[PDB]
Design an enzyme around this catalytic site. Sequence first.
Site, PDB file in Angstrom:
ATOM      1  N   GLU A 213     145.315  15.654  -9.886  1.00  0.00           N
ATOM      2  CA  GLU A 213     145.229  14.223 -10.207  1.00  0.00           C
ATOM      3  C   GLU A 213     143.801  13.786 -10.564  1.00  0.00           C
ATOM      4  O   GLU A 213     143.619  12.843 -11.350  1.00  0.00           O
ATOM      5  CB  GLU A 213     145.842  13.357  -9.103  1.00  0.00           C
ATOM      6  CG  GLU A 213     147.367  13.423  -9.099  1.00  0.00           C
ATOM      7  CD  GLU A 213     148.003  12.465  -8.112  1.00  0.00           C
ATOM      8  OE1 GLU A 213     147.476  12.332  -6.990  1.00  0.00           O
ATOM      9  OE2 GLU A 213     149.039  11.856  -8.463  1.00  0.00           O
TER      10      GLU A 213
ATOM     11  N   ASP B 175     140.630   7.405  -3.389  1.00  0.00           N
ATOM     12  CA  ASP B 175     141.515   7.842  -4.478  1.00  0.00           C
ATOM     13  C   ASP B 175     141.457   7.019  -5.764  1.00  0.00           C
ATOM     14  O   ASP B 175     142.444   6.972  -6.476  1.00  0.00           O
ATOM     15  CB  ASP B 175     142.990   7.849  -4.005  1.00  0.00           C
ATOM     16  CG  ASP B 175     143.226   8.710  -2.787  1.00  0.00           C
ATOM     17  OD1 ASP B 175     142.307   9.450  -2.360  1.00  0.00           O
ATOM     18  OD2 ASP B 175     144.363   8.643  -2.267  1.00  0.00           O
TER      19      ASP B 175
ATOM     20  N   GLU C 143     142.660  16.400  -1.728  1.00  0.00           N
ATOM     21  CA  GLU C 143     143.968  17.043  -1.735  1.00  0.00           C
ATOM     22  C   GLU C 143     144.361  17.382  -3.171  1.00  0.00           C
ATOM     23  O   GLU C 143     144.370  18.551  -3.521  1.00  0.00           O
ATOM     24  CB  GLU C 143     145.018  16.169  -1.026  1.00  0.00           C
ATOM     25  CG  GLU C 143     146.465  16.652  -1.165  1.00  0.00           C
ATOM     26  CD  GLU C 143     147.429  15.773  -0.387  1.00  0.00           C
ATOM     27  OE1 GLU C 143     147.737  14.643  -0.819  1.00  0.00           O
ATOM     28  OE2 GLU C 143     147.861  16.210   0.680  1.00  0.00           O
TER      29      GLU C 143
HETATM   30  O1  LIG Z   1     140.950  10.719   3.019  1.00  0.00           O
HETATM   31  C1  LIG Z   1     141.506  10.664   1.706  1.00  0.00           C
HETATM   32  C2  LIG Z   1     143.020  10.624   1.834  1.00  0.00           C
HETATM   33  O2  LIG Z   1     143.363   9.640   2.824  1.00  0.00           O
HETATM   34  C3  LIG Z   1     144.775   9.529   3.117  1.00  0.00           C
HETATM   35  O3  LIG Z   1     145.052   8.538   4.117  1.00  0.00           O
HETATM   36  C4  LIG Z   1     144.624   8.904   5.456  1.00  0.00           C
HETATM   37  C5  LIG Z   1     145.735   8.530   6.452  1.00  0.00           C
HETATM   38  O4  LIG Z   1     146.924   9.265   6.172  1.00  0.00           O
HETATM   39  C6  LIG Z   1     145.303   8.843   7.887  1.00  0.00           C
HETATM   40  O5  LIG Z   1     146.294   8.417   8.816  1.00  0.00           O
HETATM   41  O6  LIG Z   1     144.098   8.139   8.186  1.00  0.00           O
HETATM   42  C7  LIG Z   1     142.996   8.501   7.335  1.00  0.00           C
HETATM   43  C8  LIG Z   1     141.780   7.751   7.845  1.00  0.00           C
HETATM   44  O7  LIG Z   1     141.520   8.234   9.170  1.00  0.00           O
HETATM   45  C9  LIG Z   1     143.324   8.187   5.866  1.00  0.00           C
HETATM   46  O8  LIG Z   1     142.244   8.592   5.021  1.00  0.00           O
HETATM   47  C10 LIG Z   1     145.562   9.163   1.846  1.00  0.00           C
HETATM   48  O9  LIG Z   1     146.978   9.156   2.064  1.00  0.00           O
HETATM   49  C11 LIG Z   1     145.250  10.124   0.714  1.00  0.00           C
HETATM   50  O10 LIG Z   1     145.933   9.650  -0.464  1.00  0.00           O
HETATM   51  C12 LIG Z   1     143.720  10.236   0.524  1.00  0.00           C
HETATM   52  O11 LIG Z   1     143.370  11.119  -0.556  1.00  0.00           O
HETATM   53  O1  LIG Z   2     159.354  12.088  -1.434  1.00  0.00           O
HETATM   54  C1  LIG Z   2     159.155  10.931  -0.621  1.00  0.00           C
HETATM   55  C2  LIG Z   2     157.832  11.130   0.120  1.00  0.00           C
HETATM   56  O2  LIG Z   2     156.751  11.087  -0.831  1.00  0.00           O
HETATM   57  C3  LIG Z   2     155.402  10.937  -0.347  1.00  0.00           C
HETATM   58  O3  LIG Z   2     154.563  10.553  -1.435  1.00  0.00           O
HETATM   59  C4  LIG Z   2     153.623  11.563  -1.778  1.00  0.00           C
HETATM   60  C5  LIG Z   2     152.236  10.923  -1.667  1.00  0.00           C
HETATM   61  O4  LIG Z   2     151.977  10.618  -0.299  1.00  0.00           O
HETATM   62  C6  LIG Z   2     151.155  11.858  -2.204  1.00  0.00           C
HETATM   63  O5  LIG Z   2     149.938  11.132  -2.228  1.00  0.00           O
HETATM   64  O6  LIG Z   2     151.491  12.198  -3.551  1.00  0.00           O
HETATM   65  C7  LIG Z   2     152.719  12.915  -3.720  1.00  0.00           C
HETATM   66  C8  LIG Z   2     152.830  13.275  -5.205  1.00  0.00           C
HETATM   67  O7  LIG Z   2     152.780  12.089  -6.001  1.00  0.00           O
HETATM   68  C9  LIG Z   2     153.900  12.072  -3.189  1.00  0.00           C
HETATM   69  O8  LIG Z   2     155.093  12.858  -3.141  1.00  0.00           O
HETATM   70  C10 LIG Z   2     155.242   9.875   0.746  1.00  0.00           C
HETATM   71  O9  LIG Z   2     153.970  10.008   1.372  1.00  0.00           O
HETATM   72  C11 LIG Z   2     156.280  10.081   1.827  1.00  0.00           C
HETATM   73  O10 LIG Z   2     156.176   9.017   2.774  1.00  0.00           O
HETATM   74  C12 LIG Z   2     157.688  10.102   1.243  1.00  0.00           C
HETATM   75  O11 LIG Z   2     158.569  10.475   2.303  1.00  0.00           O
END
Ligand SMILES: OC[C@H]1O[C@@H](O[C@@H]2[C@@H](O)[C@H](O)O[C@H](CO)[C@H]2O)[C@H](O)[C@@H](O)[C@@H]1O
Ligand SMILES: OC[C@H]1O[C@@H](O[C@@H]2[C@@H](O)[C@H](O)O[C@H](CO)[C@H]2O)[C@H](O)[C@@H](O)[C@@H]1O
Length: 752
Positions: A520, A440, A516
């Site tokens: 962004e 990211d 995703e």
């Molecule tokens: O892969 C890109 C996206 O990865 C996300 O985190 C993942 C975790 O939630 C998950 O538990 O594990 C995998 C690895 O196995 C992680 O990649 C990020 O939260 C995203 O922001 C990101 O685009």
């Molecule tokens: O609203 C609280 C929840 O927000 C989540 O954050 C999101 C990110 O994981 C994702 O990458 O981007 C979106 C948009 O910026 C966010 O809302 C948290 O992951 C949650 O844990 C939290 O409960």
Amino acid sequence: MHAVSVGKGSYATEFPEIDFGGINDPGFRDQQGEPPATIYRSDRVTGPMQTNSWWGSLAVDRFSMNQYPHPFSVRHRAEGLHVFYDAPHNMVVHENREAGTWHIHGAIGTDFTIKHSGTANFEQAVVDDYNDWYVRGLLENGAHQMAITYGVGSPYIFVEYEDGSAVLDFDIAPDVWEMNGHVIGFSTHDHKHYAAFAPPGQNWSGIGSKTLTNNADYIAIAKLPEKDGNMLAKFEQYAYSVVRDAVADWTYDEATGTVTTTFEVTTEAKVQGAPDGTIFALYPHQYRHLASSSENQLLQNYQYEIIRGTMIGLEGKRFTTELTYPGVLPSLPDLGDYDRERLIGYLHDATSDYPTGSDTYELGKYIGKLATLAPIADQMGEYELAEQFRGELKDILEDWLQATNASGQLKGKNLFYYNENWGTILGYHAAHSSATRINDHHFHYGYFVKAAAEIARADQEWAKSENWGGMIDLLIRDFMADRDDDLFPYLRMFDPYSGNSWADGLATFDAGNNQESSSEAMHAWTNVILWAEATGNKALRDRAIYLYTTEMSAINEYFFDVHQEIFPEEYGPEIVTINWGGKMDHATWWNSGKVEKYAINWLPFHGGSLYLGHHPDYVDRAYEELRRDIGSTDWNLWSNLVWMYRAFTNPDDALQQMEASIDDYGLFDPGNEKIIERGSTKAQTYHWIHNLAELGRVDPTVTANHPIYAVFNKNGNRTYIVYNFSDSPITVQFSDGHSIQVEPHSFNIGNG
Ligand SMILES: OC[C@H]1O[C@@H](O[C@@H]2[C@@H](O)[C@H](O)O[C@H](CO)[C@H]2O)[C@H](O)[C@@H](O)[C@@H]1O
Ligand SMILES: OC[C@H]1O[C@@H](O[C@@H]2[C@@H](O)[C@H](O)O[C@H](CO)[C@H]2O)[C@H](O)[C@@H](O)[C@@H]1O
């Protein structure tokens, strides 16, 4: 020092001793790490290592995970390369009603395994070479080597052998329907059509059995579009031309707005007289924009079904696509019919907002929010407030852009660090595996570039290289470097052929890489356009223009399916939230509700968001489906984002919903994003919807001979918007004959 000075800033060259700030949470702490030590690459691949690729798991895993070089899926194993194709019977569409999720996916099967006669026990598979979109995987066991060349958009897999010969192994005996000696057409027991090619005289054996063998040290595999000998004969023509180079070269024609991309391979002959070229498999986002001069190279009936719809065959050395860059703005101008005192109030309310974390992402969201408020404050005559926001931006960046404290030691947080092993700038505190998985970087750093672009808009001096500009341009280089960058691989995030960026640095998933939030990504590209324009960096600007425009083309196909040709009819939603190499999900990376599975591909709203409004029927279709699913206009979360999206086609409705609910809650509340999403504000929401109400619809049929513009159309009446970043006045020619003079550092209309 363990730091490198860059203008007034610096980055760490040794891993900092992290300040965990008393947080004991194992998750948070594990985040404050580095990417893997082991890179599976040969000594032929040196320099900053490529990441965020469709093929990444080859580099990270000992062998690889499942990969999608469309039309194929493949995976490396000790026994050799497993090859698969998702036929219709492999494809499913599943819904989990309670989760509100949908999944379009195939199977992780094996049609056959490409093997080496001398070993079924390779020690590892390494990256031995790559280019803009092909990879060369090298299965290694001492003298035994098998080099596999493959790529997205390649219906060929090229196989080179050392100290052995070719073996194709099947669980069930294939039907060899065409036997030309050294060339075979075959089908799996379940009717998937392939071909294999060896040099003349090297004949295939084992016909009728589960194991097909050839004495050659070179074979090719092709996925055939049909069980058809004429096609087999065509595939023969290029089956001995192994791709060594592949480049996607682009130009931006500023006069017309056209982004022209040429995809060119250079091959190496494996038999005498092999032509220099290949058969490309084009994705929808490519062939829908095919240049006239490439049309004659199409192989009309050569179609492949894949997760991203229908691929088509094209033959030769190169092909070209043509796209239209639509412009971006630093923000919306002052053209709304808002109550000005009410907007001023919301602007002051936003001084209560604060970041909901110390990591690059949460801090990013906050600074993007401030950068979004500052032009609105200017417009409302609140210059002192605008200056407070820009001052806070400066304070935040001048902190983060230095790696050392007042005594000259490395800081424990709020800094950037160069991981040399991979060659990437990492920010601490980290989150979403931005550090541990190199994830990211465009998503996070795009917010930093936004803050810098807004500072630069008002203060050119701050933005100079010798000042804070150098560190910003270093962040940019990390996520979108040019070729021959000493510190960074080429265009880290972007896959020039799939046409989108990939968010995961490692790609260690059986679905390939993923993205995703395409919005962004588009935000990152917009901000580099703005930054580069502000700072007079033409080459950087044009690169971000190319990225913005190409990314847009992939979004409209694979996220939105604006043409209603890609998603299976039985798939209920009007959006795919996460695109993978091998599958599509209406699902989020966190446990979410109904709105978020749409709006994660809309946020944040900014001066580069107008691309979202190019297809009004899509905007209506998508909105109405979410409304149907919600059951009303009572949005489960992020209401303001829905209203802003709704304003693209129906700003009366957006206004009505806004009036009813915007003031349901007071000042910034981290625990409540029902009404205002945490990266957004009331002021932004209010400003956007009223602007769209006066301007009408985005008009993408009008281009301009400069890059910082927008054209709207309300019932045949066009509004033309230009922002001029120059010290001198400019004149802008629009494609419908309209022209306008713009004063220095201003909008043409609606400066406020
Ligand atoms: O892969 C890109 C996206 O990865 C996300 O985190 C993942 C975790 O939630 C998950 O538990 O594990 C995998 C690895 O196995 C992680 O990649 C990020 O939260 C995203 O922001 C990101 O685009
Ligand atoms: O609203 C609280 C929840 O927000 C989540 O954050 C999101 C990110 O994981 C994702 O990458 O981007 C979106 C948009 O910026 C966010 O809302 C948290 O992951 C949650 O844990 C939290 O409960």
